[PDB]
Amino acid sequence: DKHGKFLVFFGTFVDTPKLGELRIREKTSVGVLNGIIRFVNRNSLDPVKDCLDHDSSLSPEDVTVVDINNSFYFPGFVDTHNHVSQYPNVGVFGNSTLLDWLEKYTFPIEAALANENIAREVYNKVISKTLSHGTTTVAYYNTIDLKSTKLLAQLSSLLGQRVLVGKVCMDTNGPEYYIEDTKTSFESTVKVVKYIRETICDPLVNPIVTPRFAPSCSRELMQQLSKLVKDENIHVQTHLSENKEEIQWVQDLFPECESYTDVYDKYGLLTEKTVLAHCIHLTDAEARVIKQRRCGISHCPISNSSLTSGECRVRWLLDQGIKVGLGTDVSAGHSCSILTTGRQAFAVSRHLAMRETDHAKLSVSECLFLATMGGAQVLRMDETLGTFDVGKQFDAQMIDTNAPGSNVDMFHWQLKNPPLLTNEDIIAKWFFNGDDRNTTKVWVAGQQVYQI
Amino acid sequence: DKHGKFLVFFGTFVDTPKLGELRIREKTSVGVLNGIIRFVNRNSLDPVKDCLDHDSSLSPEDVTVVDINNSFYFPGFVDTHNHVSQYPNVGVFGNSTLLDWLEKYTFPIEAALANENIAREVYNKVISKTLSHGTTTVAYYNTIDLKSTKLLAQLSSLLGQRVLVGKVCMDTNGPEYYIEDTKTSFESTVKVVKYIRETICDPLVNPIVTPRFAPSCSRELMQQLSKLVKDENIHVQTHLSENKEEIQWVQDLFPECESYTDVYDKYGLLTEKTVLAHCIHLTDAEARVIKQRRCGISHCPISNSSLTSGECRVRWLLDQGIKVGLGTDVSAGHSCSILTTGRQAFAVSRHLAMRETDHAKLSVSECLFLATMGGAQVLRMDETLGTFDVGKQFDAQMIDTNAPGSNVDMFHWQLKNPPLLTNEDIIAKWFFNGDDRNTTKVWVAGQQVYQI
Ligand SMILES: [Zn+2]
Ligand SMILES: [Zn+2]
Fold it and tell me: Which residues does the annotation say bind Zn(2+) (chains A, B)?
């Protein structure tokens, strides 16, 4: 436990303060106290003295130095969309697309997690696994079950991950074994919000109102949830414009509205803290509404490709000023890793560029931005998360490209006559061939929550 | 060393004898002697007795039992296209597409490997790394250098991997520091073929004539190589129809020919043992020629996406009766893993299916076929490689989904009321979230060449 202890981390710090930038700070000291970065000193010669210069009140006794050539600190990844309850089905989907996959795999597994013994095992596994891949902040969809959603929030608090935890709302178009009535769906949401805020009462654990998607939620439910969201200033998360059959269904179910996006708009769910997953098939008018309402988009490339949903037009969304982050979308996406997700965002953008010009491509640094600051923006936490900057939370991971078993390797003669690698090249090697085995330590709010 | 010892492997064996099939044989005994599978007995109750029943000459002393719930044998992967010399640049390519990437990264690194000290390090690393990912057979492009290509063949023999080793041929359109004259390019190819066949003299190590691609090879060189290929019955490998600027260049360079494919056809390089990498932008006429000449195609999805080359129409090629395998295409593709390659073939086929109907999608089992039997077909080795069948080589890997650090996990309650996993589902979980850490042992020609 590091509360009350002044920390200073010394070494190389890599982050992405602006889309397209990759900031690499060598031989740098980062002072941290009670989870908050207090200073960042490049070319630091004396990390302890940097702390004493920063605060007259300190003595050398009060300072803990943490010392990092092939290693660097990187911010924690932000997973803006993850159905923790679906994790038993990662890799399991066959030839199916969205609506068949929901019926065949997803409602069955979510219903099964009403068993607290199963749910506890799944939650412990997913929180620990995502942390081990460097995910420090995650927006979780759970299930319609109040009690299991409360357990997920409790275990999140215990294990030290930064989370938003949602009870899924479904009062229409679900199987009889896995559906709510309207009053229960609303009242259970009120209870979970109060329980998280007043009982769990942990700055790292937030509620989030979670209408599953428009086919699952009546107009009455959406309007009731809207009012709660407004009155209590709560995050919202839902799916939008993922699959062509889904979109046709929404049009058939809500023909009084102009579009899928207009359904959420008219029934009050589009806010500055609304996280919209997928957003593939949007019209220009829909994207314009999203921009105007200041919602954020969770780009889920692994799911989108795996379920043959489509290609998210990430550059087109960014070009309009919409904030975009990455989501794993477990289990439609098979991976718990936002690094894996970033690699697939890179690939998807090139499938689009094959037809839509090079403008559509995302660079390595842009994908790392989406994986960190982008997700922080989508969660309206970018003032406190996503980079190594004064005043922000020390949510961070240690990357060691020479960790045991690493698939990232570099020959001595490549390191600064044969061609030499830049620092940027080293980061790219981790981006493409790194995995969890290179994440050796993870900190959330300046507390070490994971050790390899 | 297992020569002279009758082996019997007992456990679960998984392979793909026909495209679209996934054959799972539990509690099965596979007898192996001097690299060759001698019997496959399902529901074996006594593996030693199975050997004694198979061969009257044996005594129990002569039999070595190898005993495998979460583990199975799978055939070795076949990497039909890998530029080992480019490995220092994996992950390093920036925003570039093919022709810029060649000039900026590839000719510089290949030239640098004229230094035997560098080359030896790279070859040891790539052979060991690919083996550790389960690749038992690989077709390597090296460089234009005779001596380093000989070293690669020598180290391949020493380390036990099954290989085809090519000296690259370039006598046109290269930098002055990295180009051959025609006579040297041809005569050095004659020497490397003789050295591999007569000096290395190892059934696991074969030569392969390697015109880099049409822009690099004069008409005179291609015709001279053709005659050698025919007279000495040698494999051929080259690139075909990867990138639109490349294709335009070929048309400008060979306007007497009808197409890129027609260049290779007219100058004699299209044979039953020709391995054609990429094959993205083929006309119907080109694919028809490939079918008629019985060439095989190396599908390289990671490279194709990363360099924004295009989408290989794998189903369309298979539909015409052309054999297709997988290639890593190190370093345009960042990964040494054919499992990673298979996952990306799965994804690419769905990008095509988004526009070309579900017919274009490849299943998990089909990708595992391309990764094993498909590559064996492309190399004209499918009678002896690619499945667990009598008379074939024991090129195999042990997959343990519970190996240390595994990202493939399964809850006890999922294993045969909550939904249960099939055997096929378990294989899919490894396909999507497995990596080298699940490959715990690798055998080539019935000799263990790798241990985790
Ligand atoms: Zn989702
Ligand atoms: Zn290649």
Answer: 81, 83, 239, 329
